[PDB]
Amino acid sequence: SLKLGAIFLEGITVKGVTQVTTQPKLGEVQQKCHQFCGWEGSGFPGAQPVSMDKQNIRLLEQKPYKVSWKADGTRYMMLIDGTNEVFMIDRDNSVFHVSNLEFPFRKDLRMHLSNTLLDGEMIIDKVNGQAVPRYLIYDIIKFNAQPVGDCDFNIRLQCIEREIISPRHEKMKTGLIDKTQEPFSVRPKQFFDINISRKLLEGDGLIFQPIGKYKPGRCDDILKWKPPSLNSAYNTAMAVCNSISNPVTKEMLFEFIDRCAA
Ligand SMILES: Nc1nc2[nH]cnc2c(=O)[nH]1
């Protein structure tokens, strides 16, 4: 099913970012995404976290995790496959084509990456007191057709910096990649050791990612945390309702992580 009139970012208008409705390009982009994620269904192949609760919270002492700010952005998978073949995919499976957002190859800046699929969200940051869209790279499923998604989270984060972010910065500072003519900025999401979650909540929640490998669908492994208050499908919301009866206070969390901490 197609969604006509799809919006890339409610509010701000982004030139260079237009929804793909033409075929076969639409089915090709979607198909390629599903194959990279090894998803069989038809919906969003991307990974779906689950709200933290007094039960799965124990997973933090059972294996290595990383944490980071839980922004209020729009989820989007970015399929980078060749020059002028940069596409954004949302939860509704809508596809948007992005013009002038180049992704050079680490070894040959005149080359362009392909068979690459990033995962992250779209945010509307305020710079100099003005709306400016940014894409935060959370994960990376496939790099140049390589199953980097199967690697630990550590390696995937390095791949993004080393393979995606670094090359782009090189061509901007050396070649002709004007960050002002680009549709939006591409910055990497930053993760830290969970034994410092506290520091992140002082300056809107947290998200705990395990070192395991990328997995599409529902990941009861990935825990997103949101204050008991301001805490918003039926089955999905069902885990949000019973979560209100026995909520994980910011204290319960920190205290738990401190107990676990080495
Ligand atoms: N793992 C993961 N969690 C998210 N939470 C919001 N966006 C994302 C994402 O792209 N990946």
UniProtKB/Swiss-Prot annotation:
GTP binds at R75, R91, D119, G120, E121, K224, W225, K226. Residues 5-262 are annotated as: GTase. Residues 106-162 are annotated as: Interaction with POLR2A. Changing R91A: Almost complete loss of RNA-binding and loss of GTase activity. It comes from the Eukaryota. It is found in: Nucleus. The active site is at K70 (n6-gmp-lysine intermediate). Interacts with SUPT5H and RNMT. Interacts with POLR2A (via C-terminus); this enhances guanylyltransferase activity. Binds (via GTase domain) to the elongating phosphorylated form of RNA polymerase II; can form direct interactions with the phosphorylated POLR2A C-terminal domain and indirect interactions via bound RNA. Bifunctional mRNA-capping enzyme exhibiting RNA 5'-triphosphate monophosphatase activity in the N-terminal part and mRNA guanylyltransferase activity in the C-terminal part. Catalyzes the first two steps of cap formation: by removing the gamma-phosphate from the 5'-triphosphate end of nascent mRNA to yield a diphosphate end, and by transferring the GMP moiety of GTP to the 5'-diphosphate terminus of RNA via a covalent enzyme-GMP reaction intermediate. In the N-terminal section; belongs to the non-receptor class of the protein-tyrosine phosphatase family. In the C-terminal section; belongs to the eukaryotic GTase family. This is mRNA-capping enzyme. It comes from Mus musculus. The gene is Rngtt. The chain holds residues 226 to 567 of 597 of the full protein.
